[PDB]
């Protein structure tokens, strides 16, 4: 509309109803000029770390992380009272846009409004550009609504052929100025709507039964098994007798079963105590990338983390593996620390009922056919893929964790649940791209066909609001005794948690899963 | 609408009619940035003074004090002609908003308009945030319409557990950016309406009878009482005789009565003459907080001031207590003075008809059952709570005093009249919150996920208008002789009162109650 | 319910202490009484209480 | 808390008697009536609308 | 109970001669008499409690 | 405060162990318990205060 | 029963009633080996908070 | 229930189920009970063996 009229309002709220919750979040953003208005091809040839791609002058909005849309109290209402969750629908607004001229004259910077400058915005609803929003990376909104965030720069990667970065003829370049975009001055605003495709609810419960205990403890099976090949307690001794017996109540390892535990790929285990670890360097011929379970694409080594869903150690246990996601608190400085106390460990231990341990094995298997002259031999199953009859449980969603991922576009996929957690989506929420339109500087008065390299220095600010409709399943259970709940157990604190401190800093000192309530198999 | 169009007009008026008066007040406000756009948790552990809470970047409007809405002549019309008062309805406008960029370059500050900046406003009509407006504190509009005032900063307190400030798990944090808010540029304006819940009229009259004199002076009672247990004028002497007599006209202390005076909690009495006071230090083991009547919550000592309604000394008397509210004139400098002449003392003496004195007692009580060998003993009743049959009178409203208070949200309360005076309201007039929206400064051209700490320096100005509909009861009385009125008795003055002085300063040199007219019990 | 103790007297003259009708120590002084504005008022009958 | 219901950042416009004497000790010093405004940070001395 | 007793402190009690109303009290009004008053006028004041 | 202090009289304070209700008090009722009573019958009497 | 649902703008998490009992030989709120059902805790109703 | 490790001791995730907590039909000698059920669609079992 006009310069003196606001194009939007601040809406941050959560509306609860039975079966539904609607969250809305508004933030203030600042967008700089990226790459000095240029596309730049980027890459380095570094063994397994070899990459190539392009960085763009554009930037984009990602709300993909849960604490963007929920307060700690709203997250508590959700996970204590509900078995399930899934987004129905979304809409995004960008408004109250302000473009700033910045000038340096005497060595100090002054800022003024440039009222006729535009910002460009388009949402890619057709997914024609590489989708980077699901990669588990920084640039999402801050969890605290008063914080102002910088819009992250957009870039993508190509095909890496071997361990060299050099492109081949299959590599694609994407110019974003090649997409129709809405141009906005200070009176203009942007809006888009989105509908989530139907997806299974996340399970916000933990099992109150074990996969192998599903039977009736009071009853025998009508099935029979071989109890022993000899009399006595000792191997390779006694008289040889085939002793068959009914499977009685009380020996539950020998019960026949309809179902098996899920798939496993063993993971290397590490101790939070420095003295209990073998000494493995960070880089070298023998490095920690070598010893972690890893996959190989096209010669390159990729850490398998978190990997297929598996039970893992508790968050307070000494041991941990790459199956656990790790978050940091404020205390570390410099992107490195020697203390695990500064870090937020995640535990999948809840799924120990239906899932094999990450650091142990799926089971043990008979290698050979024994006979009178051949002793039985067993081997470990460290990695076992899926066989008919397995049932498993997906990784939990976290308050600091990703909401969704984009299912890769390929002609096959299996159980498309994202391994870092959340909702696999063939058509995820679109990426909304934004850049500052270049404003040339004072030109030369003689025509030159060279492109304009000289530009006014600018940046823009504004507000962005995101609304999501969530569908929730209310817990209904006949359990008599009380459930586990998520509570404040923190006790007496100098500075209370989940609030700003003396200096005005807002930190998240815990990692909160969704699984508290229980449900029987 | 637009930058060159005013979004409101100046309305300051009072419209009088029989049964109704409507006041309207317009002021100019200035809003700075508070806490440098941050929430800050605040507290100190100081014995009884221990507190904790948060200060917010937000600020709020409070008109809660009477002289905001009335001129001294309008207050005179009200209290001379009317027995009663109470607000019907309210509406508030905020308009003509101006956001200013301030820049420092050579060591001097320049100010410019920032036309695209917004200010955020919301009224909390649902009372979900702690209500601080009733606390009897500074930040209300100035009484003189030409004065420009600063908008007060908002903050609240938590639960204090013991004498230590450390929070427990019951403490709540409130983010105001979590409430939907209207965003306003210079063309935009804000408006809200409010209806007062029905509340008893304030009594603008003083009683022309005494609670104990309500009888007919010409007549005897038909009741009888014990006059004496002995002959003669002396105690423990004479002949023992039970002497019964009718209660005759002329001895009115012995009349039987239907009603009792109100409740009392004795208060310590101080003299305005320094030589007539015992020497009590301000702080120490023995301090003045120790000697004043006080209450104890959770170990902490709170001054009981003003306390339950009680008659007190005249405003010109030598003695005073904490039952009296004290206001200051301009003369003191530095928030301290040794002279009572600089202070405006308030007197409840008008209620001496139905209320016990603040510094004396409720009465005296018999301790024991006397007999022939036991002499009668009496003790003072310093504090007596309410018994069936008491009738009392509330504290008076003052021209400098608070209009309303919020009744605490609790499952019991008794006679919810605010002890500092005014109208107890379950749903009081809402708090209207305002802050300047942050405008980031020139950012870095490389993405960082840290929050933006760098901001343009700004402030905003504008006008706020408040309209209140008041319902008034006109005095109707058959009193023959003239009433006491509120008049200008000041005489010949170098600088007349209730007007600006030579230097342009507007001060209030008197404290004006509402009780002049009289009414019989 | 609420209580304000009241002084007790005997209908038997010999069982009462000797209290004069008027004086410095009078019966108005010994009866439970209230004070408005300095004046003493007999609290009679007073708040409801069981009696003899 | 009932006694903390106020705004911690603001002073009252009310005034009270701070002390009857100079110094830290009882029954000592010079006799002076010292009045002061009720400042932020001393919350025991705030005037209040409600009682426990 | 006047005090908090302990191993070295004996418990002490005092009489409650006058006690006002607390939440949870229930009482009974004075009886009407054939020679007694029928009604009274409730005083005109901005508070009264149990106007019997 | 028990007494009115003066230049020759030191201030004296006493404890309030029992204090009934005065105008302006606000309180909070006892909590209900999972093992506790749901209701009670208000006694049939011609007065009661805060019948919780 | 009629219930009021909590609606509050409190940002940080509430205190909740949870099973904190830990690892138990015989779990609480269930029958024991001998078939006896006991209540080993007393549970109030006040967990959530509200401002004055 | 859930078995945690090789020890039987329950944790806070274990559930107890009282069946007297479900509405049930009570039957004397003249009464009878009936219920109907529909199978969800499921693939046929293969009652054949492969000839290739
Ligand atoms: N996150 C996610 N996205 C998409 N598809 C998924 C996901 N997780 C599982 N699946 C697939 C595989 C499951 O067997 C099936 C469940 O469908 P239903 O009948 O709805 O339970 O859907
Ligand atoms: N200030 C204030 N706010 C709310 N309630 C109050 C107040 N003062 C007294 N009351 C209550 C207690 C009184 O007995 C009653 C009078 O109601 P009526 O019939 O209207 O005279 O209302």
Residue numbers in the entry:
A (entry chain B), B (entry chain A): 222 to 742
C (entry chain G): 483 to 534
D (entry chain I): 431 to 482
E (entry chain G), F (entry chain I): 587 to 638
G (entry chain I): 691 to 742
H (entry chain J): 379 to 430
Task: Give sentences copied directly from the paper behind this entry.
Adeno-associated viruses (AAV) are single-stranded DNA packaging viruses of the Parvoviridae and belong to the genus Dependoparvovirus. The virions of the AAVs are composed of non-enveloped capsids with T = 1 icosahedral symmetry and diameters of ≈260 Å. They are assembled from 60 viral proteins (VPs): VP1 (≈82 kDa), VP2 (≈73 kDa), and VP3 (≈61 kDa) in an approximate 1:1:10 ratio. In this study, the structures of the AAV7, AAV11, AAV12, and AAV13 capsids were determined by cryo-EM in an effort to complete the panel of available structures for the defined AAV serotypes.
